[PDB]
Amino acid sequence: EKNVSIVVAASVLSSGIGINGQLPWSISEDLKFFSKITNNKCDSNKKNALIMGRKTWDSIGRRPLKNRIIVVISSSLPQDEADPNVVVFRNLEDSIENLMNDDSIENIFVCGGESIYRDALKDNFVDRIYLTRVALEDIEFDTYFPEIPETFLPVYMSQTFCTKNISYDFMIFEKQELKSIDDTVDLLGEIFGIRKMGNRHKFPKEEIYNTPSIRFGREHYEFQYLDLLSRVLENGAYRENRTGISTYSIFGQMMRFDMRESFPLLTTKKVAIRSIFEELIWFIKGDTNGNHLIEKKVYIWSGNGSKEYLERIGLGHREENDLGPIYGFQWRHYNGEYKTMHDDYTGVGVDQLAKLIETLKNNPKDRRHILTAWNPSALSQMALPPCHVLSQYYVTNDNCLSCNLYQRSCDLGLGSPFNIASYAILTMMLAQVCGYEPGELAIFIGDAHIYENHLTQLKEQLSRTPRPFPQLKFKRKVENIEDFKWEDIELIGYYPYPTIKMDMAV
Amino acid sequence: EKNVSIVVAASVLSSGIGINGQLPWSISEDLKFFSKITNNKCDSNKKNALIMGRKTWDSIGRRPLKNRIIVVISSSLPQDEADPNVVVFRNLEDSIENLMNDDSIENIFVCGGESIYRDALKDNFVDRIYLTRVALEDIEFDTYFPEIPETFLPVYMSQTFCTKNISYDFMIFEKQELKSIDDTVDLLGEIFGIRKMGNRHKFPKEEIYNTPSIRFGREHYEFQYLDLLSRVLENGAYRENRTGISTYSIFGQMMRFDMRESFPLLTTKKVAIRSIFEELIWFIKGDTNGNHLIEKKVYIWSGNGSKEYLERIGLGHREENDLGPIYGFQWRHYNGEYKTMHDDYTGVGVDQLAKLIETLKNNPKDRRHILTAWNPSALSQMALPPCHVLSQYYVTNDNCLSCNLYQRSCDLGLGSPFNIASYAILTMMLAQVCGYEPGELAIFIGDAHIYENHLTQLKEQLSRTPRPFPQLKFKRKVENIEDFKWEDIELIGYYPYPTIKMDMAV
Numbered sequence A, B: 001e002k003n004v005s006i007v008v009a010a011s012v013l014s015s016g017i018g019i020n021g022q023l024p025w026s027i028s029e030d031l032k033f034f035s036k037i038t039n040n041k042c043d044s045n046k047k048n049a050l051i052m053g054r055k056t057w058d059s060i061g062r063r064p065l066k067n068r069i070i071v072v073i074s075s076s077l078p079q080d081e082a083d084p085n086v087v088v089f090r091n092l093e094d095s096i097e098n099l100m101n102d103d104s105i106e107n108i109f110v111c112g113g114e115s116i117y118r119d120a121l122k123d124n125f126v127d128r129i130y131l132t133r134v135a136l137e138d139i140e141f142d143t144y145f146p147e148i149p150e151t152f153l154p155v156y157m158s159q160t161f162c163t164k165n166i167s168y169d170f171m172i173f174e175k176q177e178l179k180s181i182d183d184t185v186d187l188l189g190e191i192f193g194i195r196k197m198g199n200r201h202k203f204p205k206e207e208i209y210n211t212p213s214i215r216f217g218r219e220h221y222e223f224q225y226l227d228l229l230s231r232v233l234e235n236g237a238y239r240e241n242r243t244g245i246s247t248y249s250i251f252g253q254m255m256r257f258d259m260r261e262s263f264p265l266l267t268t269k270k271v272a273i274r275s276i277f278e279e280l281i282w283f284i285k286g287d288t289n290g291n292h293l294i295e296k297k298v299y300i301w302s303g304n305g306s307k308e309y310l311e312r313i314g315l316g317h318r319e320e321n322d323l324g325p326i327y328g329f330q331w332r333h334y335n336g337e338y339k340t341m342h343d344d345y346t347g348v349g350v351d352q353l354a355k356l357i358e359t360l361k362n363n364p365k366d367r368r369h370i371l372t373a374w375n376p377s378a379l380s381q382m383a384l385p386p387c388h389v390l391s392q393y394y395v396t397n398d399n400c401l402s403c404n405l406y407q408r409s410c411d412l413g414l415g416s417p418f419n420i421a422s423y424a425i426l427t428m429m430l431a432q433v434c435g436y437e438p439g440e441l442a443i444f445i446g447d448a449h450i451y452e453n454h455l456t457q458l459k460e461q462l463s464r465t466p467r468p469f470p471q472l473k474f475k476r477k478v479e480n481i482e483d484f485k486w487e488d489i490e491l492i493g494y495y496p497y498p499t500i501k502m503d504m505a506v
Ligand SMILES: NC(=O)C1=CN([C@@H]2O[C@H](COP(=O)(O)OP(=O)(O)OC[C@H]3O[C@@H](n4cnc5c(N)ncnc54)[C@H](OP(=O)(O)O)[C@@H]3O)[C@@H](O)[C@H]2O)C=CC1
Pocket: A007, A008, A009, A010, A016, A017, A018, A019, A020, A021, A022, A023, A052, A053, A054, A055, A056, A057, A059, A073, A074, A075, A076, A077, A090, A091, A092, A111, A112, A113, A114, A115, A116, A117, A119, A143
């Protein structure tokens, strides 16, 4: 009685694994994973057995794999005894004689085809599943991986990797069937109520924890957002704010995101990527005219730029969509005397974005690559004070550009998915203009909250197991950061769950 | 064969437990901990046995404890059979007959005196130790807790609690004697080198991990700093900077600190608390004269305020210790045209600190309580750009004041211990002026680094097991935040390790 594991690489949605007798992709790192996961043994005097169908045996050229014994399932192949590294059995059941005897076999792996996968789960022989989800779907398949039965639960999900612009994950599904420290902490939690800081930061309950079975393997960095969503539902204090819609708020959180091998665009909800870019390039160009976004069918700044909202906050004399000095006016013309959105401010103010780019490539190891937007002198003229307040940038020793963002207030339903993608794109743009590669993205949050009208929606989003991040590449290299266009951005491998509607609190 | 645990409350340094037949302190929460830790049982049809000496039996008034069987060790007391909850044995060895028979006893606890504690460890009967370290030392003891033998290792250290201005911890010492997820992550770490983000954030090795035996119980919030020290020693990239002393730097870190029941002043190194305050009140008053700190014997701003350093950065015309517009000039006179340190700036600039206090008590649930110091227009006039750049404050539903601080650059040897205490004191001052209690302190760090001349010192600091945080209380309630004086601050229960000398990089 030893371990039997399935190793497979299937597509993310349709679970396709083959086409015309070969794989529908060429991922080098995946083959290395298969080689290391099937050679992983504890006894040096034992070998691992790899069960596979005949057509798969034809796919690998009918040649043995080093340090392993290939078990071919076929009714026609002659049970040859010449090659000691290849053995043939007539049916799958007989091949599981590796259990009963043959103590020289330590582990068993089932890396066959649809025919072998299907009647290996149906016959209930599989203990573990090593799944390699690949983000390719608009191609043709003819051989699929069967649906994972409900007896299996995911226990690990790696970060999203990239090979030839193809995103892929690594998951582990397992078949389901000290206390002295935990008890002492519980007893101290009963004595001190909210005096013990642990009780102010309780672990989320299972009913609000996305994919609860993955306990120790929450490596995928979308969990940095889905678990922040859970921490708010658990510890969020019911509070009122400037709007009529109350929130559940906690203070002091952070999220990390990789940008080297993936793009932190959430997959549990279809995020409008075009509107994010059109807002970011709107900041970079220095524009404050709210109509230029409406002319491009971007209505995210319409609520805070209406005639009734401006008169309500004391800016009735201001024009319709004149948001005033905001993001992109403190970036390009800091401390500049703002008049209207039609005047020409070329030359006035401190150009932080220009000095940022000039410093990033003339002094990379400088510790002052900071782009701020909090101007106390201009706060009263703003239609809305800056939420993503201050950002710092960092050049690593391997010529990568990381980014840290502090956010005073975070709408986890609407603003947060945008802010993650927006500052990811901005870091990539700065990397190309300065000649670096994208690094990491860390977002530090002050007032992390959830609007009470988003409770039914965000609980729906938490019920969706995350999919691998897509890839974002630029089609051309620009000479100045202002020259970026929407046609220059190519989003590769984005297969999200259906979009979720959530109303903005004005 | 069941479990035998020691329960004891000893002083932090000398390990005193008694005086004149009674305890040297009155901590209510500690007695509740003893009651719950000795009643913790799994079988409802069994009771726990509490072994204690005769003099301890006199201390509790010779009356039984509910739901427990007290075992008194005494050579003179008559072995009475009347009370079934009290039994007397002639020696400690005979009393450990609870093991051999009497299956109605589930657990055994040794909460005796020095006489019972000493020959319970010497006879090697103890499996676990529940230690309650109390921060009282300048009093008189006559009964001590014996030194913990090397066979025990700490596995848990709770946060610092407060009762009647007395700080105390809870530790657990234990006697020393799935893999499928860990292996898959290791295999992916071999395939992808630094492409897997986990390899850029490696767990610190044991030789640089403070108190490595405490794996799952790093509750004490001094570990938020000692483990950041370890993460830098593990992943820190060797980089040069504006000074001649290179650093080991990582990007994007955070630390949490409780301020309700303790004061985050590091105990692994004696921190000059007076110099921290004199710098903070120097900021609050709006002063930029570097000599006023030297007149108060505070020389932390002498390196960056010398005649040779000012001429080196292009400010030769500036006076000797005229640091220019820095912290405390952007706080009180933001965007104010700076001349010299002798002029009168009363009225010019935006007073953030005043508007911060006015907003904290007139609109607590506001999400804009932000105090910034990054002014791009005044950066060129500064002797040193702001390190603690921007801070945000938050009022909880139970009238507590939390604080978030973003720090672009962090000298983990010198600036970090100061910044932790400085913004802790500032939050407490704002709480008293606004009528709140201290809450939490979260510090978000950009360039967290360690200067290479601090390597021998910081490794020494990592070899010291942390002690409970002290308490900081104000002697009087001030009417304005500027009225605070050093005589008004009382530091209670600070018993740190000896101070460590580290040179500042100018
Ligand atoms: N992405 C991935 O991880 C993997 C993908 N693949 C791909 O899948 C494709 C091949 O898989 P597939 O087409 O399903 O063929 P299979 O690999 O599953 O093998 C099929 C053969 O196995 C034998 N067989 C199957 N069931 C039985 C049975 N109940 N009793 C006796 N013999 C049986 C038959 O051999 P016979 O007719 O001779 O008796 C049959 O022709 C290829 O494109 C391959 O590249 C393969 C492995 C892994």
